[PDB]
Design a protein around this nucleic acid. Structure first.
Ligand code: MG
Ligand code: MG
Lengths: 34, 52, 324, 141, 109
RNA sequence: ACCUCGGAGCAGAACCCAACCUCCGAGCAGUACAUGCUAAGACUUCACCAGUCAAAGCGAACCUCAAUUGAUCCA
RNA sequence: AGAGUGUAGCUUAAAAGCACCCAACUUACACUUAGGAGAUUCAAUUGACGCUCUGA
């Protein structure tokens, strides 16, 4: 079983990881093109 | 190989329809529409007309 | 013989030996999108359609969206698929911002413009809230093409057009019993002093809708015209006949169509009373008659035809005996 | 009586007359192509990258009604315009617009995956509870 | 050594060319494969024959081809098609001539 | 050697085309038991026989395969 | 010092569509479903904040 607070923390974890790896892939592609 | 079998209505009506089945499968029972009763009733294989 | 194509053949520009290199539709969805776009695009070959066919606003909207994003409860509900929307507020904002265009689309679909104004269009900028008072407690609203029974429309409606000289007209577009290209005028309040409607001039008294039985669904339109400058206007059915196109041709300079609202009515018991008492006539009853079934010319020898062939061409089912 | 002068044949010019009487033709062909044209009104849902569109379109192609998350009125009351919440909200708004427009029946033609989608299920439920039956009456011949 | 091949011609093909008035139920074209695809107001029989579902005029057109999502072979062909490509097929259409019916005054109650 | 039936060339494009011409095949199988009843309009192997498709309707649910067969009489 | 100038990666898009990413189904990819971020450089058509090119 689980709780609402940890579910919300997990959702925010997914959100921030999405942003972080989006920036990672963006910088990788920038280096590739450069 | 298959055999032609007369499926007879269990509704008591003399309604018979011929179907086919494997000669090695068990005697066959269906839910077939009986026009006399105007309803799907059980039909049970009665006799083997011929071997097809 | 090989007549050359009369234009760019489809799948011509893309066609190239580098099929392996070219990216492909990996999804039926993207293929369908492209195919639909191509179908919409015009073509030189025979096709189905031929035969059957500011900055402040942006800033404020961005700030509002940012505030909604910041609101944690909103995000919690969104990710828990439990958030809802205020339907009434959405309706009001639709009216204020983009309601006129969708209402214009509805009117065009219903054929109001092609009939009321013979094709000429106009955006109903001014929202028009019309409601037929039902009982002494409620009132059926007439939004756009909704269904309101003549029983409910027995008494004249309450109109609240928010503005600050107006003319309101109720016109039945397809209720005319004698002339296909004619309308019926029901009530015309002209020179209305702004929002309040009780002070308008009663050019024509209110006549409730009377869609004949078995005559189908009839469409009635509330036309609202802003009156630049006040102007003068000029139970018998011949005088209730009305061509809105001619009327607006006469009053075009001083009138501008700024509001629209229509509803659909079918026959009801109240129509009988309207016909018998108010109009003092025998109510007409119409029926939908399909064309008679087609049969090929009867042959002397209907070869290979069933016995029903002769029944297809006999008129009377009762036995006949000729001379006997 | 002069007022009793009625033409023998009535000419109802309302486009929706026969459709509402359930007598108008509805294209029965296109049995080898998708979607089927056998309808008077179709609910077409377009899920873009950022936005969700829900149109009620007549067989002739005229978009009778529309509900897009790209309108300010709707987009200013929900968090994300590309989620199940957005689809449910646009479905309810479209149901209200259809009821006020007189459109009570439609023919939804989703692909297998679209039908299995949770968002499409929510949109269909929203329309049903709003008062639109996604199954047009059979034509009367 | 070579036996058979004595079958006669099926007499298949188009029975109603474009512009021909067609009554409901008339067979427009008989085909062994899908040469002409069904269009508006045209139905397909079990043997792929196209019959008129309405009374009107036959029109042949070229229209984009969008198979049913459950037609696995066609969906696979599409999935392998390059982007920008659109399939086209010949479709048969019946432009209905007469209206569904007319409203007639039946009784002046 | 063949005799009936179907697919492909000859017969490139509506239909149709011979050959003791070139090649492939068939004389089933499988799934279901509304593979129920009726009924406009059409197709048709160049006749007939036979063979095909089918709107609408009643009643119900919410047929694949090219051939895959055979009349009358009589049992 | 001068020229081209200028919407998130792309758009003879006008704040959109394609793009793009992780989660699940996939060995994997792909599809599909769920979600994610995103811009019209700043002031009155004009001037000046940033990029490219031509030079030293
Ligand atoms: Mg041959
Ligand atoms: Mg013949």
């Amino acid at each position: 079983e689980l709780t609402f607070e940890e579910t919300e923390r997990r959702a925010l974890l997914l959100k921030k990881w999405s942003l972080y790896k989006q920036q990672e892939r963006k910088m990788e592609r920038d280096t590739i093109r450069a | 190989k298959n055999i032609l079998v007369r499926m007879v209505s269990e509704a008591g009506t003399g309604f018979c329809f011929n179907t086919k089945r494997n000669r090695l499968r068990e005697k066959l029972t269906l839910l077939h529409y009986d026009p006399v009763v105007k309803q799907r009733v059980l039909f049970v294989e009665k006799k083997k007309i011929r071997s097809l | 013989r090989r007549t050359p194509p009369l234009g760019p053949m489809p799948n011509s520009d893309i066609d190239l030996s580098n099929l392996e290199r070219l990216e492909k539709y990996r999804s039926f969805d993207r293929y369908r999108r492209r195919a639909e776009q191509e179908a919409q695009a015009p073509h030189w070959w025979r096709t189905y359609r031929e035969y059957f066919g500011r900055t402040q606003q942006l800033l404020e909207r961005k700030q509002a969206i940012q505030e909604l994003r910041a609101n944690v409860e909103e995000e919690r509900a969104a990710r828990l698929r439990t958030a809802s929307v205020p339907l009434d507020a959405v309706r009001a904002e639709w009216e204020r911002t983009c309601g006129p265009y969708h209402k214009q689309r509805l009117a065009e679909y219903y054929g109001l413009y092609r009939d009321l104004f013979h094709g000429a269009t106009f955006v109903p900028r001014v929202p028009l809230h019309v409601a037929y008072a039902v009982g002494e407690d409620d009132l059926m609203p007439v939004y756009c093409g909704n269904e309101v029974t003549p029983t409910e429309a027995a008494q004249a409606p309450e109109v609240t057009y928010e503005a600050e000289l107006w003319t309101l007209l109720l016109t039945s577009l397809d209720g005319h019993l004698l002339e296909p290209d004619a309308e019926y005028l029901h009530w015309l309040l002209t020179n209305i002093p702004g929002n309040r409607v009780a002070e308008g001039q009663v050019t024509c008294p209110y006549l409730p809708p009377f869609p004949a039985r078995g005559s189908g669904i009839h469409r009635l339109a509330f036309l609202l015209f802003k009156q630049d400058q006040p102007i003068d206007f000029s139970y018998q059915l011949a005088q209730r006949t009305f061509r809105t196109f001619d009327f607006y041709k006469k009053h075009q300079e001083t009138m501008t169509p700024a509001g629209l609202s229509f509803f659909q009515c079918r026959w009801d018991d109240s129509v009988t009373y309207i016909f018998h008492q108010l109009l003092d006539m025998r109510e007409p009853v119409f029926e939908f008659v399909r064309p008679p079934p087609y049969h090929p010319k009867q042959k002397r020898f209907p070869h290979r035809q069933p016995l029903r062939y002769l029944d297809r061409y006999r008129d009377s089912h009762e036995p006949t005996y000729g001379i006997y | 009586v002069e007022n009793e002068a009625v033409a023998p044949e009535f000419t109802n010019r309302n486009p929706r007359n026969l459709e509402l009487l359930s007598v108008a033709r509805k294209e029965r062909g296109w049995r080898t192509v998708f979607p089927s044209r056998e309808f008077w009104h179709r609910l077409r849902v377009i899920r873009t990258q950022h936005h969700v569109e829900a149109l009620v379109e007549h067989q002739n192609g005229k978009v009778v009604v529309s509900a897009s998350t790209r309108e300010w009125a709707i987009k200013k009351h929900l968090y994300s315009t590309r989620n199940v919440v957005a689809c449910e909200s646009i479905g309810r708004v479209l149901a209200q617009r259809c009821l006020e427009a007189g459109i009570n029946f439609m023919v939804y033609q989703p692909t297998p995956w679209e039908a299995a989608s949770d968002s499409m299920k929510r949109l269909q439920s929203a329309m049903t509870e709003g008062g639109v039956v996604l199954r047009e009456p059979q034509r009367i011949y | 050594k070579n036996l058979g091949g004595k079958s006669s011609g099926r007499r298949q093909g188009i029975k109603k060319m474009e512009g021909h008035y067609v009554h409901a139920g008339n067979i427009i074209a008989t085909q062994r494969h899908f040469r002409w695809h069904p269009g508006a107001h045209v139905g397909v029989g079990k043997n792929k024959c196209l019959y008129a579902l309405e009374e009107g005029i036959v029109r042949y057109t070229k229209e984009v081809y969008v198979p049913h999502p459950r037609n696995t072979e066609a969906v696979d062909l599409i999935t392998r098609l390059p982007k920008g490509a659109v399939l086209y097929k010949t479709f048969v259409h019946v432009v209905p001539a007469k209206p569904e019916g007319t409203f007639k005054l039946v009784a002046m109650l």
